[PDB]
């Protein structure tokens, strides 16, 4: 008080360590997008349950070899074949059709010739196999993909579209997954107006609340809009009390930061009895960033107090909030993805570790993507035909490196799905 | 008939060209995620509307330089200041607070010292200030009348906030494509059902829906449809009336049982652009368009093979859907990566579901063909085998198509 300048490295690990992992719940598989399995998933069937043809052709005997064969019928999809392949006989099969007994190989239609058909010309009767087949050729044996009783999905798996389809395959329509964090977002400041309102003297429109919510919703977490809150202990405590009762995470933006006008941290410590882990982070932007946890009824809520500056709000949210949210929803490695890219613009370095919204662009035969830094607020909006999907990670300036130039390999954090 | 083997290159550009761009509609700015602006957006205000302090400190006169100063008052946020900074005087300001007349520079509190005082009275400025220091002049961020968002912009969280900044809460954007998904095949059961002889569970419909839903497009579940012209026609007719895009999976591609292509041609009189694509997997992939009432619906017939379905859906459907919702470049992002495993090459251009992982201090990511804890976010793009290149080895630079969150 004033809080010590916490290093960027320590501030990040503090958030993750103090961030809890939510409990679990049972959901339907169709709602499993982005969910993390808290259970092993076992298959109760074989895939395929029956020998299935890979190609459109004929179920044949390899020992019969090439030559003229009788077509005893066709194996239909969804039906266990009733006829048995005798020597000299074949059965027409399509891709996915069950293989009849007696057959041990499938010759595709491209390696065949239709010899003779019925007098009506409506039925195939005799076919010539032009090739020699190996036993098991173009056949998916029982359980080739999935064996019965086999673990197809382990606990801790972060599920996508394919993992949902896999659940549908094995027939497990109900799974145990971690809950999603409910995120409440509010804005503080006596100068803030709703975006729907016209400007008044000394007033600006609240943009952080819209951006923050949009950022969380992009990750698919449920959000709560607590609206604009006056910068005073009474209104802050009411908003925080509402957010705590309704959400697992409470994000606020604005506030008069440090000093004796620091209502935010006064309410947190004195009224709320919350533990403030840090109030200042040696970074740019987002120096006045506050992170706190609160334990109620054995449940830990986390509270982010982000800077009022619009650029700082989105940057700090991607750096601290999102990794914390990913941890709460059960992701084993909640850390952000950091890739290598080349600078599209020269940039002066700051004594503090600096982060810039940027646009990542991959080219045709170029191995590394080009990261064009967005100056901050408006610069990109002349070339913003694409949304900023990256976060340029600039090192703190030293006597060695005071300025970075065009083409150098730098760290960029992917902050949005491409 | 059987449809000519369309090259993978031609099949892709055909889908995009034949795929239309949807009309526009008015939405609230809070619903603008992933939307494309069909209009320019101009600012009607200055940002900031007033000169604002960057630091928490005191508004000073640069001409006065360092020395002892009188605190005439404090500039509150949301209030227009009434006092004027005279020589030898300063005013306490917070970050974002309006700058009073008379002051041309801001000295942060770290460069000051309380001399004499619920109210402060005197302070010493310890440094010399440059005119305009730590001050955001009127319109420094956004000037009035300036175009802040051009039409064609694919909006994200920041664009939503920019809309909220300028006060444009209603914007004109392209519609999102409504996509109907159905599965065909007499062997298909619902995932809730136990297996019957010769039957498997329908997984394609779940995967395809989840794929489309991930991009935020509204979807319609047409369920399982029998492999016969009557049921197919009913399902297609329903999908056509209710959706812009109809996706089907399964069904006999080749033979004469091609009920799907029979219905499309005979009953619906739709134009089939290709029925086969020289690719692995997804050879029996069909793309058709249908013009009803001056409106073009698009139809995808994906292979029944589960792996083929998800691959063809990311290669053809998603780029088509992005074009419909107004995205200027609907082409997927392709990156260079290293192979995590050796792989035999196929005469056909091959595609594998893979997982992109960036290792520390390593410029290129590694792609691992289907760790198991993570969902596949990439689609490995293997080249067709030619000459000396019969096989690709571990460490070689290959193309990977981003299909998920990195």
């Amino acid at each position: 008080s004033p809080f010590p300048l916490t290093s960027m490295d320590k501030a990040f690990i503090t958030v993750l360590e103090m961030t809890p992992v939510l409990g679990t719940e049972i959901i339907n598989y169709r709602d499993g997008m982005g969910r993390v399995l808290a259970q092993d998933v076992y298959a109760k069937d074989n895939l395929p349950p029956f020998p299935a043809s890979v190609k459109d052709g004929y179920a044949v005997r390899a020992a019969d070899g090439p030559g003229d064969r009788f077509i005893i019928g066709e194996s239909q999809a969804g039906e266990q074949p009733t006829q048995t392949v005798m020597p000299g006989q074949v059965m027409r099969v399509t891709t996915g059709a069950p293989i009849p007994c007696g057959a041990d190989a499938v010759v595709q239609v491209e390696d065949t010739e239709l010899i003779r058909e019925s007098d009506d010309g409506t039925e195939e009767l005799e076919v010539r196999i032009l090739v020699q087949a190996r036993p098991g050729q173009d056949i998916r044996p029982i359980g080739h993909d999935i064996k019965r009783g086999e673990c197809v999905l382990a606990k801790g798996t972060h599920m996508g579209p394919s993992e949902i389809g896999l659940l549908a395959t094995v027939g497990v329509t109900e799974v145990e997954v971690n809950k999603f964090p409910v995120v409440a977002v509010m804005s503080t400041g006596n100068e803030l107006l709703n975006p729907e309102d016209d400007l008044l003297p000394g007033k600006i429109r609240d943009s952080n609340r819209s951006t923050l919510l949009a950022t969380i919703q992009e990750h698919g977490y449920p959000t709560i809009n607590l609206g604009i809150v006056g910068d005073n202990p009474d209104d802050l405590l009411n908003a925080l009390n509402e957010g705590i009762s309704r959400a697992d995470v409470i994000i606020t933006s604005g506030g008069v930061s440090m000093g004796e006008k620091d209502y935010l941290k006064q309410v947190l410590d004195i009224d709320l009895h919350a533990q403030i882990h840090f109030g200042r982070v040696f970074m740019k932007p987002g120096l006045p960033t506050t992170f706190a946890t609160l334990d109620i009824d054995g449940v830990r809520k986390i509270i982010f107090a982000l800077p009022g500056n619009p650029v700082s709000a989105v940057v700090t949210c991607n750096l601290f909030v999102v990794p914390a949210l990913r941890k709460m929803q059960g992701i084993l490695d909640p850390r952000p993805t950091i890739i290598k890219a080349r600078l599209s613009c020269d940039v002066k370095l700051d004594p503090r570790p600096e982060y810039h919204r940027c646009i990542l662009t991959w080219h045709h035969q170029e191995p590394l993507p080009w990261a064009q830094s967005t100056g901050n607020q408006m610069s990109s909006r002349l070339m913003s035909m694409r949304s900023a999907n990256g976060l340029l990670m600039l090192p703190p300036k030293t006597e060695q490196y005071v300025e970075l130039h065009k083409g150098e390999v730098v760290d960029v954090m992917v902050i949005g799905r491409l | 008939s059987p449809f000519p083997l369309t090259s993978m290159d031609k099949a892709f550009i055909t889908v995009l060209e034949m795929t239309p761009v949807l009309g526009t509609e008015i939405i609230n700015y809070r619903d603008g995620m992933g939307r494309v602006l069909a209009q320019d957006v101009y600012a009607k205000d200055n940002l900031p509307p007033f000169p604002a302090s960057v630091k928490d400190g005191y508004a000073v006169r640069a001409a006065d330089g360092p020395g002892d100063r009188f605190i005439i008052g404090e500039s509150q946020a949301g209030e227009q200041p009434t006092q004027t900074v005279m020589p030898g005087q300063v005013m306490r300001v917070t970050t974002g607070a309006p700058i009073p007349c008379g002051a041309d520079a801001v000295v942060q509190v770290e460069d000051t010292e309380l001399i004499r005082e619920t109210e402060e009275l005197e302070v010493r400025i310890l440094v010399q200030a440059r005119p305009g220091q730590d001050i955001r002049p009127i319109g420094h961020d956004i000037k009035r009348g300036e175009c802040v968002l051009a039409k064609g912009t694919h909006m994200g969280p920041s664009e939503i906030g920019l809309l909220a900044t300028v006060g444009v809460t209603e914007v004109e954007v392209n519609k999102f494509p409504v996509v109907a998904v159905m599965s065909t095949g007499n062997e298909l059961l619902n995932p809730e059902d136990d297996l019957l002889p010769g039957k498997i569970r329908d997984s394609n419909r779940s995967t395809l829906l989840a794929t489309i839903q991930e991009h935020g497009y509204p979807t319609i579940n047409l369920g399982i449809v029998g492999d016969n012209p009557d049921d197919l026609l009913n399902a297609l007719n329903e999908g056509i009336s209710r959706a812009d895009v109809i996706i089907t999976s399964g069904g006999v591609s080749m033979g004469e049982k091609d009920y799907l292509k029979q219905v499309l041609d005979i009953d619906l009189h739709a134009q089939i652009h290709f029925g086969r694509v020289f690719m692995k997997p997804g050879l029996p992939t069909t793309f058709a368009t249908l013009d009803i009432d001056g409106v073009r619906k698009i139809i995808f017939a994906l292979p029944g093979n589960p792996v083929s379905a998800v691959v063809t859906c990311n290669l053809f459907v998603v780029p088509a859907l992005r074009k419909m919702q107004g995205i200027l470049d609907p082409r997927p992002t392709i990156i260079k990566a290293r192979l995590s495993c050796d792989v035999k090459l196929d005469p056909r251009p091959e595609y594998h579901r893979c997982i992109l992982t960036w290792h520390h201090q390593e410029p290129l990511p590694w792609a691992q063909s289907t760790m198991s804890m993570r969902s596949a976010n990439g689609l490995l793009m293997l080249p067709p085998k030619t000459e000396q290149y019969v096989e690709l080895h571990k460490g070689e630079v290959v193309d990977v198509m981003v299909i998920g969150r990195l």
Partner: peptide, 8 residues
């Protein structure tokens, strides 16, 4: 893994 930024 670093949250700050490396060089080359």
């Amino acid at each position: 893994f670093s949250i700050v930024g490396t060089l080359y």
